Amino acid sequence: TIKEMPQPKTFGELKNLPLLNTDKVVQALMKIADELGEIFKFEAPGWVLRYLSSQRLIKEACDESRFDKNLSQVLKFVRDFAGDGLFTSWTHEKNWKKAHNILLPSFSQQAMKGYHAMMVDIAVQLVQKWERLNADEHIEVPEDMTRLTLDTIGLCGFNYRFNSFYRDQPHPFITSMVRALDEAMNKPQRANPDDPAYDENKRQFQEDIKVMNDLVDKIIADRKASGEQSDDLLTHMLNGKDPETGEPLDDENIRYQIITFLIAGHETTSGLLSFALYFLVKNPHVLQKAAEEAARVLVDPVPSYKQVKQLKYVGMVLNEALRLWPTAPAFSLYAKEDTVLGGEYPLEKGDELMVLIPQLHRDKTIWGDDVEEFRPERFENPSAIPQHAFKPFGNGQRACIGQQFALHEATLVLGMMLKHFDFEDHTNYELDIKETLTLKPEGFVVKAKSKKIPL
Ligand code: HEM
Ligand SMILES: CCCCCCCCCC(=O)N[C@H]1CCOC1=O
Numbered sequence: 386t387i388k389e390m391p392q393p394k395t396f397g398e399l400k401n402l403p404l405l406n407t408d409k410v411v412q413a414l415m416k417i418a419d420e421l422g423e424i425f426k427f428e429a430p431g432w433v434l435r436y437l438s439s440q441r442l443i444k445e446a447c448d449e450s451r452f453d454k455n456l457s458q459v460l461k462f463v464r465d466f467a468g469d470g471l472f473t474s475w476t477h478e479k480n481w482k483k484a485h486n487i488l489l490p491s492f493s494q495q496a497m498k499g500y501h502a503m504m505v506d507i508a509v510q511l512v513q514k515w516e517r518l519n520a521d522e523h524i525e526v527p528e529d530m531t532r533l534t535l536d537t538i539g540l541c542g543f544n545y546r547f548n549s550f551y552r553d554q555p556h557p558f559i560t561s562m563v564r565a566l567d568e569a570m571n572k573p574q575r576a577n578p579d580d581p582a583y584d585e586n587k588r589q590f591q592e593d594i595k596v597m598n599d600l601v602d603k604i605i606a607d608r609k610a611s612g613e614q615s616d617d618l619l620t621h622m623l624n625g626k627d628p629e630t631g632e633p634l635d636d637e638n639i640r641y642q643i644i645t646f647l648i649a650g651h652e653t654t655s656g657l658l659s660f661a662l663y664f665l666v667k668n669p670h671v672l673q674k675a676a677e678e679a680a681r682v683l684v685d686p687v688p689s690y691k692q693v694k695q696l697k698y699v700g701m702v703l704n705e706a707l708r709l710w711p712t713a714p715a716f717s718l719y720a721k722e723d724t725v726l727g728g729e730y731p732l733e734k735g736d737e738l739m740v741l742i743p744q745l746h747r748d749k750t751i752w753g754d755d756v757e758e759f760r761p762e763r764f765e766n767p768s769a770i771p772q773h774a775f776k777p778f779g780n781g782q783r784a785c786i787g788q789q790f791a792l793h794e795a796t797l798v799l800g801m802m803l804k805h806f807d808f809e810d811h812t813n814y815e816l817d818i819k820e821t822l823t824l825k826p827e828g829f830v831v832k833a834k835s836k837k838i839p840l
Pocket of ligand 1: 653657715716785787
């Protein structure tokens, strides 16, 4: 049976659009998914998006012979400063496949052995920050984790120190990057993009694009002149050759990759870590298990690569945090041809889809009745997870190139956090989820009591 798909509440000639007039649009879409179910159509004057929430349907949409990565309105506006970087390029664009093939060995598990020492440098900065806090003081979790992860990609990306822990006041790159991401994410909700009440936003966006371009072009130019061969993504991209085309990346596409990376570091792995610590202090049985592992495995003052690989339960904690609050909550796809989804939903070539990863990860048919429970033990058998059930890093050849990088950093940092401190939810924090490009807990504070283990 061919069926009509449900649609949420309309607003006259604006259709669904005003439902985007919130700073918590994923959360609203999750609430809409709870009401309407495995698939609903979302219509604006400009476009139509079909939202997928079931494993059944999402496993079809993850067929690369039938569907390809789409740029949502948001990614299309991110492209104004991330250009044809790996994140904002179409799959069939020459520059996607070039950068993909050149950078893939830079992001392998083997390569993490190289980034390790630099990840540890920033990890120790956090631990030492927290060791030096006075007894009557708390930790601003997403704030400090976003400091750690930004600095990690600065050092590994292009051997630059943001020094995030050494200032309250942000780096001028980061003011512009955050304001551009805000404007990119806010544009699609405007009924009339071209009203003079958005001319100041338009001016500020152009300025922020220029600021980001100027500063990364200088970095690229300084590196080309020094001939300096640091083991960072920038050297790799400067010496890189695509085996297919035989071409290197042009300086402009390298600018887009650095901008892309700096966005990923600031938005994503910070959210994973913040949500991990949240679920630990709210599940002290799980916190105690994570902490015993950290204590038993991290027997040296500085964690080795090998020792991070051995933090299995910390790894399980991270996966279960990515299940309930995938900090990157969505990916879009398009129909490569006319076709039928789940034998029920006729699609035309070019029709846009959106996977709500938070809903896929709540599918009771996949995860059973205890779906809202935080149980890392769900991942204890890694091979029991069905195909296309857990997609915190997207799908196929357009999956996250930084997945090995993010889980290494996350495991390293959470390991060291659990070794060096006990954590109290002193304020009985009520989950409040701030949405940028990514989901983070807003206002999440804890107290860390030092376990007095020397570094
Ligand atoms: C916990 C951390 C992270 C999560 C949850 C995450 C999630 C994702 C997701 C869902 C996608 C696919 C987007 C789509 O289909 O539209 C993606 C793509 C990407 N991510 Fe991440 N990400 C993380 C960390 C990182 C980091 C640290 C980097 C780089 C420093 C990074 C770089 C990228 C890139 C370059 C792509 C585009 C890959 C391509 O299509 O070739 N990510 N990420
Ligand atoms: C990978 C992290 C970013 C997640 C994707 C951003 C989009 C999530 C919410 C959503 O569906 N918004 C629609 C509104 C119109 O066009 C969009 O883009």
